[PDB]
Design a protein around this ligand. Sequence first.
Ligand SMILES: *[C@@H]1O[C@H](CO)[C@@H](O[C@@H]2O[C@H](CO)[C@@H](O)[C@H](O)[C@H]2NC(C)=O)[C@H](O)[C@H]1NC(C)=O
Ligand SMILES: *[C@@H]1O[C@H](CO)[C@@H](O[C@@H]2O[C@H](CO)[C@@H](O)[C@H](O)[C@H]2NC(C)=O)[C@H](O)[C@H]1NC(C)=O
Ligand SMILES: CCCCCCCC/C=C/CCCCCCCC(=O)OC[C@H](O)CO
Ligand SMILES: CCCCCCCC/C=C/CCCCCCCC(=O)OC[C@H](O)CO
Ligand SMILES: *C\C=C(C)/C=C/C=C(C)/C=C/C1=C(C)CCCC1(C)C
Ligand SMILES: *C\C=C(C)/C=C/C=C(C)/C=C/C1=C(C)CCCC1(C)C
Lengths: 296, 296
Amino acid sequence: RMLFQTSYTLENNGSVICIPNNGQCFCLAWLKSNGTNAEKLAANILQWITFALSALCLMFYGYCGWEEIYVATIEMIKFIIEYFHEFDEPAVIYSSNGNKTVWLRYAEWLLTCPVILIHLSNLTGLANDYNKRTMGLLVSDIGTIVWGTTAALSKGYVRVIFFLMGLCYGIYTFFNAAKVYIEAYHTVPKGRCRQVVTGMAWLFFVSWGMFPILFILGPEGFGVLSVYGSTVGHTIIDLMSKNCWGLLGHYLRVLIHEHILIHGDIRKTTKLNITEIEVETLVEDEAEAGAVSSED
Amino acid sequence: RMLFQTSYTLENNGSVICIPNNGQCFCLAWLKSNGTNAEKLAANILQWITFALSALCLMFYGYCGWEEIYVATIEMIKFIIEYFHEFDEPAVIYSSNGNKTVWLRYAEWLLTCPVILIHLSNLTGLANDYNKRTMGLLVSDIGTIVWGTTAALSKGYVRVIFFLMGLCYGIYTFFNAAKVYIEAYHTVPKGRCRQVVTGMAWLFFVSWGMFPILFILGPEGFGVLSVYGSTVGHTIIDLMSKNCWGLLGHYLRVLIHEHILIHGDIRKTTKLNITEIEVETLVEDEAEAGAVSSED
Ligand SMILES: *[C@@H]1O[C@H](CO)[C@@H](O[C@@H]2O[C@H](CO)[C@@H](O)[C@H](O)[C@H]2NC(C)=O)[C@H](O)[C@H]1NC(C)=O
Ligand SMILES: *[C@@H]1O[C@H](CO)[C@@H](O[C@@H]2O[C@H](CO)[C@@H](O)[C@H](O)[C@H]2NC(C)=O)[C@H](O)[C@H]1NC(C)=O
Ligand SMILES: CCCCCCCC/C=C/CCCCCCCC(=O)OC[C@H](O)CO
Ligand SMILES: CCCCCCCC/C=C/CCCCCCCC(=O)OC[C@H](O)CO
Ligand SMILES: *C\C=C(C)/C=C/C=C(C)/C=C/C1=C(C)CCCC1(C)C
Ligand SMILES: *C\C=C(C)/C=C/C=C(C)/C=C/C1=C(C)CCCC1(C)C
């Protein structure tokens, strides 16, 4: 069911491979098994569960809010292609140096990275402005993915160097993402909204941190994980990274907008020092509306 | 000088190909010539000229301003890799369906698209804010490149569909880029700054519009252009798209910042209607500082 040459004869005591001259590409490297049927079964179950969660989040969002729906949209399109042509090129790229590259995964990443990072820069949903920091986040994150994708298509020392270049860009991304979540926390009202921001920070850093770990573990790295192995790993962190995070995002947004519906937009001036940063703290009391220099 | 199998024997009256069992990948599709030596010579000259312009812009920027330098930085790194390994994987991806994909080109695109589009959203260099429109520009443009890259790795009807999906995202990008340039024009002072904004609009739409044209013309499309042919085409629009546009950008930025040094930040309220849009028109006269509803 591959559309490369799968049938060959070994000749001159296996020193020569003879293949039909039917125009089809050939490489023994491509024919290495994708893993055990147990690995494959586990992967097909988690994919359906991903399709189901993608479906329910979307219809739920149906009852502003564009960043969460899109990530679930891209996720569903991904599953329809996986269901029919998961291991067909170009969902997997079978290349001249013998690599298998899951282009399907990196494509989704590039597509939704602006969406996620815009949403990172808008947790409350109140802002009509994005700071200079947002822009550095997008530049660094897209570089990360571009270097990483290059590293996956490469081998030997060239793969090493592009992975290192991806890590350098990635560090810049993580550093600046951390400040955003710090500002978000001290901006939102003191009650349930700060529980949810905390929840989203945890999901973000753990799920995003697991991607370079699964790169090193997978066929693109030291080949510890098989291809089905890698798929299963990806489905777990995919569920956390996309569906769940945007669901927590929408929830937060709802809570914040309902705060404006009841108490109204009552900002403060919490001057942080984690530097000499500032923040506009939404509060439920009209009285509270002054400068609270909370030097951390 | 390829690191795939280039040497084979035709057997049973060319119906069988026999290749050494040395582990190397093999496909006749990969061995198709990249073009004439005249095409190649033209490509090597325009690449050096690109390296020279990249070099001079950078040292010139050496005498805020981060978006122009970066695009020239990425351009120089690109040339060092082209010089040594232009047709080595993964600068070119030689894949199982026989395609040659110039990953080197699309990587650069993804890397600098945030940089260019942030710069689009900051022509004056005065803003510390980016509107909601900027964010739609980045989301749509990265989708464009992701669909396009998928289309280049695909064949037949799958390539068609991903190209169509790229075009839909691209239209959204062009539409919104047009509004930005309209706002930029009516924001800057009435003299030389409006000449330069006009110059950058022309370079942007012509250079960016030529990329889907060169996709359809190149090996990724109807194979009208050869690989060297495609390289030459790309060097011309590359020079316009990157070096020249950022040079015009830096020039504009200089002019605007010098306006603050002489006249100061004297805004107006030009209310456009190309809708009911608004703009803050920098003027050289302190007197002029009111609402000028110029309904277009
Ligand atoms: C043909 O190839 C076979 C491969 O199995 C050779 O058999 C083995 O020979 C090597 C010596 O290079 C030993 O290390 C192995 O232990 C041998 N047996 C097996 C089962 O692998 C065989 O020598 C080759 N024949 C000729 C004439 O070249
Ligand atoms: C071996 O292949 C050659 C390919 O050149 C065959 O020669 C040609 O045969 C076809 C018939 O299928 C004609 O259309 C061509 O005009 C022939 N000549 C050339 C120069 O192309 C040849 O018939 C095959 N031989 C056997 C025994 O199968
Ligand atoms: C802030 C986010 C937290 C997460 C940060 C993750 C840290 C990962 C670092 C690993 C370094 C180990 C080296 C990995 C470099 C990859 C290249 C490689 O495997 O090289 C192939 C080899 O040269 C030929 O077989
Ligand atoms: C706003 C920017 C202005 C620029 C906008 C550019 C317009 C380009 C449209 C071309 C449509 C023609 C069809 C191209 C679709 C590509 C798929 C293709 O070539 O299909 C292969 C075929 O099915 C098997 O051989
Ligand atoms: C689809 C949703 C998400 C959140 C995808 C995220 C992907 C990454 C965070 C990838 C990170 C990489 C790093 C940090 C460095 C190695 C190369 C990677 C692209 C795998
Ligand atoms: C390196 C600098 C620039 C400006 C690169 C730009 C690339 C494009 C504008 C590509 C556009 C595409 C479109 C509009 C649709 C087909 C697929 C493409 C990615 C080639």
